[PDB]
Design a protein around this ligand. Structure first.
Ligand SMILES: O=c1ccn([C@@H]2O[C@H](COP(=O)(O)OP(=O)(O)O)[C@@H](O)[C@H]2O)c(=O)[nH]1
Ligand SMILES: O=c1ccn([C@@H]2O[C@H](COP(=O)(O)OP(=O)(O)O)[C@@H](O)[C@H]2O)c(=O)[nH]1
Ligand SMILES: Nc1ncnc2c1ncn2[C@H]1C[C@H](O)[C@@H](COP(=O)(O)O)O1
Ligand SMILES: Nc1ncnc2c1ncn2[C@H]1C[C@H](O)[C@@H](COP(=O)(O)O)O1
Ligand SMILES: [Mg+2]
Ligand SMILES: [Mg+2]
Lengths: 228, 228
């Protein structure tokens, strides 16, 4: 029914900022923000599991990573039943997908030895079965990679200001950067979701500053969306 | 269209042993064993998360408890599509239910301070949403409580021999015992699944030794099943 485009990018790269500009350029375009809000206040003041991961990764990576992906699957499946389901030409933009959760972050945490074998095995096993029960619904129809130097991201991470991610070193932002390049740019990163190989991928260089000048980016999106 | 009976009990109380006797008393009765096998070898050589929980509970309780319940939901939903779905009067016996996972074990681990607030909150939140997406399918039609002194269980735990659970002290078996008594016997334990209040519950005293003498128990089950 509804066309589901995913907005991939690094940390503080600028998805939200970007999609918010898109969101108000048509009432047939609804966004599904990353449930970061709830990751910072686990509830049904509760605990801030995002911070726990940052403070002691070798201990909370699993928990966080699991919770983070679930919360997303829900949030997205949820939006699929919004009043958007009625309009003529609907488009639902996702702030990051279950794919980048597992293949970019979880994956990298594992490689960073922050998830023992068992944790990574369980994580994958779960992640697989998860997208096999609600897969159909969330399959993407396109992906928009907001590319940006890990330097820029490190900078924007500071401009944003979330106190949890203020300790993030460039090394980290870098490792995640390559993970994106490898998957969405060079397409050398293999997943376990065959259909992802035949998915359109628009790559925009958001290193500049689209707060003001963004006319360009926008046109390339209308462009890209037509071809779907 | 299949009647789902749950066989509740303590550790090494005798569900398996018992249900195996039931299993071969009619070809319209299929069992769904606890996926313990896989808990002892994640991705079937891997890791043994059951043991991890026992060695360092304050660290692996969450992971284990989460995995254990998921693995069950799958295992059970899976069996609901077996060739049993065809026979005339079908009955599917579950070795423990998602209810006892959360309300007996997870719950007790939390109270034993083996799950910090955050872990317990996330665990519940997840568990709730889980039985709200696949609830319908797994609702029980009856429960059979195999009652037995924590002493007997401690003994049978030794007869069985799983090296992971050889360190279990009576105190533990005891705590879990009361949790069962409170829920299935005195019914004073409140859950978050309204329908469980109106569920038939047969209680059998398996403290003796049904390996041989079990004619009795069996009749009480045929009896109980008729009333459903
Ligand atoms: O051209 C730009 C684009 C973004 N930002 C900053 O990017 C931050 C938001 O980063 P964001 O949360 O959008 O990263 P995301 O959550 O989308 O991945 C905002 O505070 C903006 O100040 C900026 O200063 N100039
Ligand atoms: O009357 C009995 C019933 C059972 N068992 C022992 O119980 C063990 C199995 O315990 P079980 O695995 O059935 O506990 P469950 O997994 O059903 O909760 C077997 O090795 C039997 O030797 C026994 O000795 N006498
Ligand atoms: N999948 C996953 N695993 C681990 N940590 C994550 C994940 N997604 C987001 N985050 C965390 C890490 C960053 O501090 C922040 C980025 O939010 P963002 O909107 O992406 O800039 O949230
Ligand atoms: N829900 C749950 N939480 C934690 N540990 C569990 C759970 N279920 C089984 N087990 C473990 C604990 C015992 O050593 C054994 C009991 O298997 P059994 O067939 O139950 O006698 O398996
Ligand atoms: Mg955001
Ligand atoms: Mg058993």
């Amino acid at each position: 029914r509804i066309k589901k485009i995913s907005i991939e990018g690094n940390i503080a790269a600028g998805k939200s900022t970007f999609v918010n500009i898109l969101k108000q350029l048509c009432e047939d375009w609804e966004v599904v923000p990353e449930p970061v809000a709830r990751w910072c206040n686990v509830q049904s003041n509760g605990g801030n599991v995002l911070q726990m991961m940052y403070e002691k990764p070798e201990r909370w990576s699993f928990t966080f990573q699991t919770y983070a992906c679930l919360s997303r699957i829900r949030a997205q499946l949820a939006s699929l039943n919004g009043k958007l389901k009625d309009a003529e030409k609907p488009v639902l933009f996702f702030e990051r997908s279950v794919y980048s959760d597992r293949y970019i972050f979880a994956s990298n945490l594992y490689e960073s030895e922050c998830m023992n074998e068992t944790e990574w095995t369980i994580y994958q096993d779960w992640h697989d079965w998860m997208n096999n029960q609600f897969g159909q619904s969330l399959e993407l129809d396109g992906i928009i990679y907001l590319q940006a130097t890990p330097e820029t991201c490190l900078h924007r991470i500071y401009l944003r200001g979330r106190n949890e991610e203020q300790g993030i070193p460039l090394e980290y932002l870098e490792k995640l950067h390559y993970k994106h390049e490898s998957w969405l740019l060079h397409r050398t990163l293999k997943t376990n979701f065959d259909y992802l190989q035949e998915v359109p991928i628009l790559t925009l260089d958001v290193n500049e500053d689209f707060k003001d000048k963004y006319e360009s980016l926008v046109e390339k999106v209308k462009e890209f969306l037509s071809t779907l």
